[PDB]
Amino acid sequence: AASTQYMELNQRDEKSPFRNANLRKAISYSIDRKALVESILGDGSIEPNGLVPADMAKDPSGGKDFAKEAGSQIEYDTKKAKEYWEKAKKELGISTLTMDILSSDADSSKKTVEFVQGSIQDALDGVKVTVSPVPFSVRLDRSNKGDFDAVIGGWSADYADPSSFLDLFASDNSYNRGRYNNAEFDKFVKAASSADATDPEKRWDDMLNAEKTIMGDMGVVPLFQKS
Ligand code: NA
Numbered sequence: 001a002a003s004t005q006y007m008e009l010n011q012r013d014e015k016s017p018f019r020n021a022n023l024r025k026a027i028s029y030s031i032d033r034k035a036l037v038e039s040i041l042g043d044g045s046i047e048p049n050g051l052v053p054a055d056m057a058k059d060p061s062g063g064k065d066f067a068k069e070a071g072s073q074i075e076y077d078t079k080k081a082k083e084y085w086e087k088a089k090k091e092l093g094i095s096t097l098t099m100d101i102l103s104s105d106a107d108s109s110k111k112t113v114e115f116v117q118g119s120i121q122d123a124l125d126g127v128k129v130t131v132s133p134v135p136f137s138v139r140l141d142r143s144n145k146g147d148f149d150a151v152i153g154g155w156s157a158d159y160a161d162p163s164s165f166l167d168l169f170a171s172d173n174s175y176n177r178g179r180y181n182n183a184e185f186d187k188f189v190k191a192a193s194s195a196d197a198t199d200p201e202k203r204w205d206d207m208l209n210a211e212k213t214i215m216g217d218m219g220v221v222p223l224f225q226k227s
Helices: 021-029 033-041 066-070 078-092 107-123 136-145 163-169 183-193 200-216
Strands: 003-009 097-104 127-134 150-156 221-226
Touching: 003 021, 021 078, 021 107, 021 221, 033 107, 033 221, 066 200, 078 107, 097 107, 097 136, 107 127, 107 150, 127 136, 136 150, 150 163, 163 183, 163 200, 183 200
Parallel strands: 097 127, 097 150
Antiparallel strands: 003 150, 003 221
């Protein structure tokens, strides 16, 4: 029953600013997840280790948690947010960014999106962020068709397997709304999900590598876990 709430970034277009890993990292660095969960939400949500929830899956040989083994590459640091945005500006050849965050119009979702919008906008000089809270069928439709810059959503695990989360971000998965496309991520996540993944220790290592890959280039921006 563990869930991760995350923000997908639209990477569909070759020239999308969100295809720049330093921008995706600058966005993640600008959000104080501790404040979000403790002051804004206060509803049992916790800081996200990464994409796959903590305290959900155990190593197939010993008793080790997937999230602990993977480690965390999620940090809050606005000095780093600024530095990474400077790098992104140079790489992308841009001076400015205006981005919309599509979200649920649910009460907690509105408070989350407001906090995320303020955090990014405030930290990054030259970035303006708007928000579009909408009902479920609209969010779903726009997410599929790529009518968004960022979109907040999440995933809940029917069974406690890390691939339930990781499979979503394969380049060819329909749940990959931002069309994240990392060849190594695909390599790892498919190697795990294959019918020819009959060695559980290799499968575990493939899934760990998938988590570390998507967190390493911040292909999606996890916001919190609610387990
Ligand atoms: Na700004």
